[PDB]
Amino acid sequence: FPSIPLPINGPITNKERSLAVKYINFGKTVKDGPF
Amino acid sequence: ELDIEFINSLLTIVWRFISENTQEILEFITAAQVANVELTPSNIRSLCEVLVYDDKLEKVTHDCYRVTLESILQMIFNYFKMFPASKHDKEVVYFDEWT
Amino acid sequence: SLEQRTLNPDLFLYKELVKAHLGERAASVIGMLVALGRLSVRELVEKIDGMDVDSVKTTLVSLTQLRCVKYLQETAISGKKTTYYYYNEEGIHILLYSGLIIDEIITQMRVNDEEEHKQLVAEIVQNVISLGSLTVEDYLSSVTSDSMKYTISSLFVQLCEMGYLIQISKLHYTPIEDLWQFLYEKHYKNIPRNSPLSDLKKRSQAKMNAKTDFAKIINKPNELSQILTVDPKTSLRIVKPTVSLTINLDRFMKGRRSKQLINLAKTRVGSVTAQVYKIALRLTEQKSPKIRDPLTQTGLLQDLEEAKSFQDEAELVEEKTPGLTFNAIDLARHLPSASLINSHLKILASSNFPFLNETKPGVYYVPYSKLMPVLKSSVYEYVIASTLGPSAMRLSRCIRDNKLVSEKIINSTALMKEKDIRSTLASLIRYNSVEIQEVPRTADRSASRAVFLFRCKETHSYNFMRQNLEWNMANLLFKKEKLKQENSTLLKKANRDDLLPSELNQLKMVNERELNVFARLSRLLSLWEVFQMA
Structure with a gap:
């Protein structure tokens, strides 16, 4: 419904695809840990 | 000079002249049988x-002119070859709708 | 989603970070301190409701360990000792930059290749600060008794002496202003009565003593002379095992600043000199001028005779620092040809962008104080050309150099038609790159009998950008947690096993789309962090 997107709309590259796996296990240590 | 368009036809030729590398411009515009009737250093x-x-170019030493190498972008700061999906994608980022 | 787009400052960013990956009970209390400023426990429980007084302290120790708040103790003459609790703004930035540190260890420690601590050195950052604080005895007492621990224990003095592993103390856990008061009162009680001459200068006599004390006490944790133990047996050098240490953001943010500068070079030069510039940029990273400027945070920044002194000495420090002025001779041995070291550096001074532009002849160094303002002016004008029309890029530069532009000279200086600029200028008042100046030619400032003048106003344009991006960060973070709410009964089944053949499809399409969220956020967060160089 709103126009004018930001120009950062790209398929994820393997240079940062492993970088995104480092987030999902990071909170898994914290939430499934003590707190 | 003239209020109707086609200034950009004059604009695109001189950008090619500096890319290969203000007095130099005056004779180059006079060549190539351009459709102009009055050249002046002011224009x-x-x-x-x-x-x-x-x-598209750079201004150095108050009269010299260099190119900012926009031509390699003309061919993150990489605004082409960035196609948005925009179809069946709800998690897209918009610049409006916060004002 | 008009509910969300309206009522949200940076508090909607700060509340959701601990709502993302932590227990729920701490997202309520972190919103209270940001909204109210500062408060102790004795008035905290009156503000919240649903948390017991010790259940506050049970909750408060969670973000205490993760260094997400910062305390202050002040006692009264009549009353007891009162522990005022503030918020930590950089300890929560660790949770923001959490994955990016793992890609910083690899891209800066390139001496090793195909090592058997690749999985391990990616885990040490997940070990050092996901536990909160960290000491040496925590990881050696793990399930591996030795497993060549002495190789691993000697691996971290390589990883600590490069920086960003500064021993924590009260200085890291207390804020910047509540330290400065009682030390300035310490220097002020060092100067008693019986010096009545120039008493306005005698008030500043403690202040000159406070400036040398401030740079001294901030270097005490950065002082690397006591972070090491010279071991005569079974080793050569080792850090002290009784040191509690976490990460330091300072070298990372300077290191993140270093990656930002070279992206301008790849735009402003090709592939040869950008590779030449990349190596010499790395050598000055460990000792660089400070990005946050702790001198200028809170103090005598209101008066210009002091506000000038925060960059008069700081330029002289950056100019007369020995640990960055390279000779441009040692660069050839680091590249995997001193003429080409000089010839490919000659283009760096020739451009009008002041990096490697001013120096003493024979020595070369990159300036900082007159470079980062050009980078902020460069990217946002390109962002205007990126998300909207390039005619505004022409108009943004036209009003930039031409101070106080009119509506007649805008068609004399810039060359476009009349109808198109109305369709381009009017979106820039809405987004505050241009502003309005009015000249009252009639009485009582008549709106019709007045012409309107413009301005760039290089401060208000960037303040609107910051909160525009701080919301867009948390907007994508808002679409993270809500996707985890639905389809939660099989994500619970995806965490009880460590198999319906059609149910597995509804776990991958939700997982591929959230993979795009972290990538766009990493593209977004780099564009926002350019403008924290203040």
Whole structure:
């Protein structure tokens, strides 16, 4: 419904695809840990 | 000079002249049988400031002119080859709708 | 989603970070301190409701360990000792930059290749600060008794002496202003009565003593002379095992600043000199001028005779620092040809962008104080050309150099038609790159009998950008947690096993789309962090 997107709309590259796996296990240590 | 368009036809030729690398411009515009009737140093300085605002060239030493290598972008700061999906994608980022 | 787009400052960013990956009970209390400023426990429980007084302290120790708040103790003459609790703004930035540190260890420690601590050195950052604080005895007492621990224990003095592993103390856990008061009162009680001459200068006599004390006490944790133990047996050098240490953001943010600068070079030069510039940029990273400027945070920044002194000495420090002025001779041995070291550096001074532009002849160094303002002016004008029309890129530069532009000279300086600029200028008042100046030619400032003048106003344009991006960060973070709410009964089944053949499809399409969220956020967060160089 709103126009004018930001120009950062790209398929994820393997240079940062492993970088995104480092987030999902990071909170898994914290939430499934003590707190 | 003239209020109707086709200034950009004059604009695109001089950008090619500096890319290979203000007095030099006057004879180059007089060549190539361009459709102009009145050349003057004032208009060439006026024509050049738009390319400064478009960053197509660089102004150095108050009279020399270099290129900012926009031609390699003309061919993150990489605004082409960035296609948005925009179809069936709800998690897209928009610049409006916060004002 | 008009509910969300309206009522949200940076508090909607700060509340959701601990709502993302932590227990729920701490997202309520972190919103209270940001909204109210500062408060102790004795008035905290009156503000919240649903948390017991010790259950506050049970909750408060969670973000205490993760260094997400910062305390202050002040006692009264009549009353007891009162522990005022503030918020930590950089300890929560660790949770923001959490994955990016793992890609910083690899891209800066390139001496090793195909090592058997690749999985391990990616885990040490997940070990050092996901536990909160960290000491040496925590990881050696793990399930591996030795497993060549002495190789691993000697691996971290390589990883600590490069920086960003500064021993924590009260200085890291207390804020910047509540330290400065009682030390300035310490220097002020060092100067008693019986010096009545120039008493306005005698008030500043403690202040000159406070400036040398401030740079001294901030270097005490950065002082690397006591972070090491010279071991005569079974080793050569080792850090002290009784040191509690976490990460330091300072070298990372300077290191993140270093990656930002070279992206301008790849735009402003090709592939040769950008590779030449990349190596010499790395050598000055460990000792660089400070990005946050702790001198200028809170103090005598209101008066210009002091506000000038925060960059008069700081330029002289950056100019007369020995640990960055390279000779441009040692660069050839680091590249995997001193003429080409000089010839490919000659283009760096020739451009009008002041990096490697001013120097003493024979020595070369990159300036900082007159470079980062050009980078902020460069990217946002390109962002205007990126998300909207390039005619505004012409108009943004036209009003930039031409101070106080009129509506007649805008068609004399810039060359476009009349109808198109109305369709381009009017979106820039809405987004505050241009502003309005009015000249009252009639009485009582008549709106019709007045012409309107413009301005760039290089401060208000960037303040609107910051909160525009701080919301867009948390907007994508808002679409993270809500996707985890639905389809939660099989994500619970995806965490009880460590198999319906059609149910597995509804776990991958939700997982591929959230993979795009972290990538766009990494593209977004780099564009926002350019403008924290203040």
